[PDB]
Amino acid sequence: AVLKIISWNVNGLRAVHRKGFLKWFMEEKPDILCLQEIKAAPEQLPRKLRHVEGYRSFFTPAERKGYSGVAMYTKVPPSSLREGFGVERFDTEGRIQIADFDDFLLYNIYFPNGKMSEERLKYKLEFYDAFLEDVNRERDSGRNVIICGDFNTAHREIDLARPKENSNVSGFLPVERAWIDKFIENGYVDTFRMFNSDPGQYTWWSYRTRARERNVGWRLDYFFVNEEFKGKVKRSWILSDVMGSDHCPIGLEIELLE
Numbered sequence: 721a722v723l724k725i726i727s728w729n730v731n732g733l734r735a736v737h738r739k740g741f742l743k744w745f746m747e748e749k750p751d752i753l754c755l756q757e758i759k760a761a762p763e764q765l766p767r768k769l770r771h772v773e774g775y776r777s778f779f780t781p782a783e784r785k786g787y788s789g790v791a792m793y794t795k796v797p798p799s800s801l802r803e804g805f806g807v808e809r810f811d812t813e814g815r816i817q818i819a820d821f822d823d824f825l826l827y828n829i830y831f832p833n834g835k836m837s838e839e840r841l842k843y844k845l846e847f848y849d850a851f852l853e854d855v856n857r858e859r860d861s862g863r864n865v866i867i868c869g870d871f872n873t874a875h876r877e878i879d880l881a882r883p884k885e886n887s888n889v890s891g892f893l894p895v896e897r898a899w900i901d902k903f904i905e906n907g908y909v910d911t912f913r914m915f916n917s918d919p920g921q922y923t924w925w926s927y928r929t930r931a932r933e934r935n936v937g938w939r940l941d942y943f944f945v946n947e948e949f950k951g952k953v954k955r956s957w958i959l960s961d962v963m964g965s966d967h968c969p970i971g972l973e974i975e976l977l978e
């Protein structure tokens with residue numbers, strides 16, 4: 721048995737629902753679907769959004785209504801979920817689900833966008849720092865870990881269409897890219913790069929100026945695993961053609977212990 725995980729920053733769950741979300745979900749049939757940018761009070765949702773037959777759903781909203789928020793649909797419920805790193809300023813923005821499954825912990829993370837200001841940038845970097853503390857503790861415990869979501873940073877030049885013009889733009893700052901380097905050096909693997917070494921492989925395009933059509937995009941969304949688990953990763957891919965958000969979904973297929 722394999723387990724398929726999809727991660728998708730949906731740019732608002734209500735928004736994506738109006739653009740083919742449930743048809744896609746039913747057709748893709750992931751075992752686990754991690755979503756970011758729900759932008760909805762979980763109670764405000766129609767029961768066919770938050771209920772999808774065959775899945776347990778778990779929603780982790782921000783304190784601020786209509787902002788941020790993550791969600792997980794899973795056929796098999798986790799033994800529990802954590803909704804934070806145990807650090808209150810990173811825990812109230814609806815960015816964190818850490819779901820405890822059998823073979824592994826699944827971090828479903830909506831990493832902060834650092835573009836709006838220097839405060840938001842510091843926020844993002846410290847969020848990164850607290851994330852790294854969290855995940856290291858868990859896999860140091862002996863947990864195999866899968867981390868997915870919107871990292872809001874393109875790692876290397878290959879990871880976006882315009883590395884030069886974005887050198888001093890949050891998303892592609894040396895400091896941000898250096899964090900992913902450090903993250904990787906702690907024994908985590910960017911799984912997409914395990915199987916696909918190609919350029920032009922992105923997960924986000926600006927809605928504007930035909931960015932998706934000109935493939936002017938960034939790979940902002942990732943699946944990382946710890947080194948010790950990478951042997952279990954069978955596939956890691958971008959669902960490039962799936963529409964309805966400014967991000968496309970990304971996929972991970974892993975093989976379960978019998």
Ligand SMILES: [Mg+2]
Nearest residue numbers: 731732757966
């Ligand atoms: Mg958005």
